[PDB]
């Protein structure tokens, strides 16, 4: 498994991010800042677990489509199922989103991850892309609400909060956008980008969307 | 206009690609190889014209949305309107696609470019993304036919033709995929990636999808 090196690097980076966020979060008194630390430390903690499992050869299955037996890391979705709504929750607490908006985004998020996983396991080559399309539409719904909805909510906050939101929103739009493209061209879809390069790409995206995101959030005044 | 440097580089690269393809095409006797040279030389020739126009300050308009006046290079679409179906035509001649398939892809292609252009000029921020979504669906229809349809047609050709098709199909899937993401995150959509970086990205994509593509096609035995 040539991709082990990027699984090992992902594990190391997630583990370091977790440990650092834990040290910093433990030393924080402010009750508001603490919620954000708790949510944000969990994100690389879940990713570290899943990266470790995959490094050790768990969460990989073979799925037949296109006349080959294809390796599918399904453990990625067990990670994303829990880490993606927690990242949304960070953004939603920052702008004081309402309960029904949170529920809509978490629900859409579940649809996005669940249909992605169904698509990843589908044996009919053509139906893989139907699931992928539904997954991407649920994603674009999320991005829409974050871009239009949350930006409007953030503008009623003090400028330091709105500023931090904008940065994190931009990071999120750019980083989340790339995932369905990686899936499309990688071993899950078209089969163009080989599994090792694809693992590198997801690792760079994962670390940036989780540790990178966390660093921007947890170093800002906006959480106090 | 900080983006001038990437417009100038794009012009130079398109011009060099045109000139080189013209020199080589002019020296070719084989009647089949000549069709492919004629179509493929036109692709960077049209791009060079549009890149030159933009460098000299044509094909740029200001479109109001999101409370700002935004610069939109519309000359890109005048290029893509003609260059994208010609690239499809190259692929279709390679695999001997039928007339109705060619007509479907060219039509979908027109929809893709035309709705993209409407989206790029739309003053209501939200409706920009509706046009973008329709444009991307027309694109995904094209990619679907190239991936499933044309691959099946290429498998009935001699292996050297099928091999060349696969490479060009993979280049196309990967390169075309990136365009709607650039538009989404760039000055046309979300406004996250500034115009200069966006111009760099489109220039790299343009040169790769046109000169890169042409180099692979025109250096192969598959056209003789
Ligand atoms: C020992 C068990 C299998 C026992 C039966 C196997 C299953 C997965 C294996 C690891 C991973 O493959 C990644 C990596 C590849 C390197 O090359 C060498 C080290 C490392 C950490 C492997 C060591 C070892 O081989 C493991 C633990
Ligand atoms: C001369 C006319 C305007 C006359 C009225 C303007 C309009 C667009 C201008 C060019 C582009 O801006 C790109 C580039 C910017 C560099 O900085 C200097 C060179 C260059 C090639 C420009 C030269 C010149 O300025 C042009 C031709
Ligand atoms: C190669 C396999 C993985 C293991 C290798 C790990 C690389 C080691 C790098 C450590 C160099 C810096 C020393 C240090 O421990 O802290 C440096 C640096 C400083 O931390 P910090 O202690 O907060 O700074 C205090 C500075 N004063 C002494 C002035 C008070 O910490 C980080 O920025 C950091 C960020 C992440 Br994400 C994770 C971590 I862990 C640290
Ligand atoms: C900086 C602003 C743009 C202007 C700078 C242009 C860069 C100049 C590079 C030329 C170095 C090589 C010399 C040459 O003219 O041909 C080299 C090279 C060789 O061409 P070619 O003549 O086909 O090779 C023949 C070799 N034998 C003599 C053995 C028969 O040509 C290219 O590969 C090429 C590809 C593209 Br796309 C465009 C072009 I034009 C050429
Ligand atoms: C839209 C889409 C996807 C998006 C996944 C996302 C947006 C993942 C983000 C993960 C993070 C932020 C992890 C840490 C998948 C599942 C690849 C399947 C194909 C369609
Ligand atoms: C889908 C989509 C787009 C795709 C454009 C493509 C696929 C361009 C390819 C250009 C080439 C190959 C040029 C040379 C646009 C127009 C950016 C608008 C947004 C939606
Ligand atoms: C050639 C075999 C090397 C085996 C090393 C495997 C364990 C890696 C654990 C991950 C700890 C961080 C280091 C990452 C650098 C490769
Ligand atoms: C004031 C800080 C900048 C505001 C906006 C952030 C720019 C977008 C950042 C996204 C970079 C992610 C790397 C992409 C790797 C594929
Ligand atoms: C016969 C079943 C119909 C399948 C419909 C698929 C539509 C989903 C979008 C297709 C994206 C395909 C891009 C493929 C490039 C490998
Ligand atoms: C600082 C002003 C420089 C002006 C040069 C403008 C003309 C560029 C024409 C393009 C020819 C290829 C060279 C590209 C390298 C910048
Ligand atoms: C035998 C040659 C390789 C077969 C498949 C080609 C791999 C995909 C090439 C696409 C690289 C384009 C660069 C992407 C820049 C964003
Ligand atoms: C009220 C008008 C409805 C608009 C529907 C837009 C759906 C199109 C997909 C949205 C993609 C938005 C991503 C935005 C990230 C900037
Ligand atoms: C108490 C606030 C600091 C961070 C809290 C930790 C939340 C659980 C993550 C522990 C994983 C090792
Ligand atoms: C607050 C408004 C609730 C809207 C309903 C959620 C829609 C789910 C997304 C559709 C994805 C295909
Ligand atoms: C947005 C993702 C960019 C794609 C990176 C392409 C690398 C593919 C190389 C294929 C190796 C054979
Ligand atoms: C005759 C075959 C070689 C290439 C033919 C040229 C097609 C028109 C492009 C001319 C642009 C300068
Ligand atoms: C040969 C079959 C013709 C199919 C009709 C073309 C459909 C256009 C694409 C829809 C994009 C929204
Ligand atoms: C698939 C396209 C990749 C996106 C490249 C991101 C560069 C954005 C930097 C923003 C500068 C402020
Ligand atoms: C084609 C993608 C469909 C995404 C739906 C987004 C609608 C915005 C909510 C009003
Ligand atoms: C959501 C994108 C819709 C694209 C349609 C592709 C259908 C494949 C033709 C049978
Ligand atoms: C959540 C919508 C269900 C649509 C499933 C379509 C299944 C086709 C393979
Ligand atoms: C080609 C389909 C036409 C749909 C246009 C919808 C316009 C909404 C702004
Ligand atoms: C979340 C959708 C699951 C439906 C399962 C269908 C598998 C053939
Ligand atoms: C993506 C890492 C940068 C985080 C530093 C925050 C700047 C105040
Ligand atoms: C190709 C669709 C064009 C329709 C124009 C509508 C502009 C408001
Ligand atoms: C993308 C440029 C490579 C073209 C060389 C063709 C290999 C036979
Ligand atoms: C033909 C099925 C395409 C799925 C589209 C769902 C948004
Ligand atoms: C060769 C493709 C690797 C690109 C990944 C860099 C982030
Ligand atoms: C990736 C962009 C980070 C900028 C940080 C400023 C708060
Ligand atoms: C609500 C409009 C979304 C456009 C989807 C077209 C494929
Ligand atoms: C800083 C972003 C530029 C990346 C473009 C390289 C192809
Ligand atoms: C970008 C991949 C090019 C490989 C060329 C082999 C024909």
Numbering used by the authors:
A (entry chain A), B (entry chain A): 7 to 230
Task: Reproduce passages from the article.
The structural properties of HAD16 mimic a phosphatidylcholine structure. HAD16 can be used as a tool for analyzing lipid-membrane protein interactions. Microcrystals of bacteriorhodopsin obtained by the bicelle method were mixed with HAD16 and then SFX data were collected at SACLA (Supplementary Materials Section S7). Although two heavy atom sites were located by the SIR, SIRAS or SAD method, auto-tracing was not possible even with all 18,069 lattices obtained. The HAD16 molecule adopting alternative conformations binds to an interface region among three symmetry-related bacteriorhodopsin molecules. The long alkyl tail of HAD16 interacts with the hydrophobic transmembrane surface. The choline and phosphate group face the bulk solvent. The aromatic ring in the head group ring is stabilized by π–π stacking with Y26 and hydrophobic interactions of I/Br atoms with L22, G23, V127, and L221 from a bacteriorhodopsin molecule and W80 from a neighboring molecule. Because a lipid or detergent molecule is located in the corresponding site of the native bacteriorhodopsin structure, we concluded that HAD16 binds to the same site by partially replacing the lipid or detergent. Thus, we modeled lipid/detergent-derived alkyl chains and HAD16 together using partial occupancies.
Membrane proteins localize in the lipid bilayer of biomembranes and play a variety of important functions such as transport of various substances between the inside and outside of the cell, signal transduction, energy synthesis, and cell adhesion. We developed amphipathic compounds, phospholipid mimics and detergents bearing multiple halogen substitutions on aromatic rings for de novo phasing and revealing lipid-protein interactions. Serial femtosecond crystallography (SFX) is a new data measurement technique of X-ray crystallography, which takes advantage of the ultra-high beam brilliance, femtosecond pulse duration and high spatial coherence of XFEL.
